[PDB]
Chains A and B, each alone.
Chain A
């Protein structure tokens, strides 16, 4: 299962 949070760089 992947990491569920996305954050723009």
Chain B
């Protein structure tokens, strides 16, 4: 059981359609648990998973105060970065930040993360030592100097090693029936002729959690990496995930093909064939 917590912030300017929108979401592994949106009728931190709802008024207020302050801070940062890049006010831009902590399985701080981006390009990241910064360009160097002056890295290290980890463990215990439960994929193999001489074998995995899974096709026991059409893992909407992998095979050669699935929730790895 290897777990993580992450917060994802998106700050987006929109001239002249009002002030930049700030939205924060928090996740434990593949489960979202909180959101904040500066655009909501009444901006407040809101629960998005049942196990967080037991947190009391003081938690909710604490969160909301931080995200409100961040709303104002990010609007200034957007102004600053527009300045650093000599950009016009025209002119819509995005700052993103993702930070958090990884635990081992095991249960102690494996490593911490804090990364920011500007218009979808790396801008500034906290190094794995949690003590120094990697700035992408001369603009991000300005941010770096400001962040050094305010001793941000030191504050982050203290959070990533302390609170981040402590609260992740509390969430894992509170939501243990779901967060610490791996649901194995339900699997099957479909067959659809494409022409007289070729057919598609599709290996399906449904209903699994967490999202991490490996689906491969083999011909005579060797990987078919270039020939496998692999779909991005997708949410079912009920916390579970879906994925498939397809190969096009010469008709008559179907039995030479095997599908292999690895997922934490499985007693042991699966080997599947098309079963006529």
Complex CA gap A1/B63 in Å reads: 7
State the Cβ distance, B161 to closest chain A Cβ, in Å. Answer: 12
Q: Is the CB of B63 within 8 A of A8?
A: no
Binding site of B, secondary structure by majority: helix, strand, loop or mixed? helix
**Does chain A have a CB within 8 A of B7?**
yes
In the complex, the answer to whether A7 meets B146 with C-beta atoms within 8 Å is yes
Summarize A's interface: helix, strand, loop or mixed.
loop
Q: Which residues of A contact B152 (CB under 8 A)?
A: 5, 7
Q: Separation in Å of the B101 CB from the closest CB of chain A?
A: 11
User: What is the bound-complex CA distance between A5 and B155, given in angstroms?
Assistant: 8
Which chain B residues numbered 144 to 192 have a C-beta less than 8 Å away from chain A? Answer: 146-147, 150, 152, 155-156, 159, 163-164, 167
Q: How many residues of B contact A (CB 8 A)?
A: 31
Q: A1-B163, A1-B164, A1-B167 are in contact. Are A6 and B69 (CB under 8 A)?
A: yes
The 3 closest A-B pairs by CB, nearest first: A9-B77, A6-B73, A1-B167
User: What would be 19 A-B contacts, judged by CB atoms less than 8 Å apart?
Assistant: A1-B163, A2-B7, A2-B26, A3-B156, A4-B159, A4-B163, A5-B159, A6-B69, A7-B73, A7-B147, A7-B150, A7-B152, A8-B73, A8-B77, A8-B146, A9-B77, A9-B80, A9-B95, A9-B143
A interface residue numbers (CB < 8 A to B): 1-9
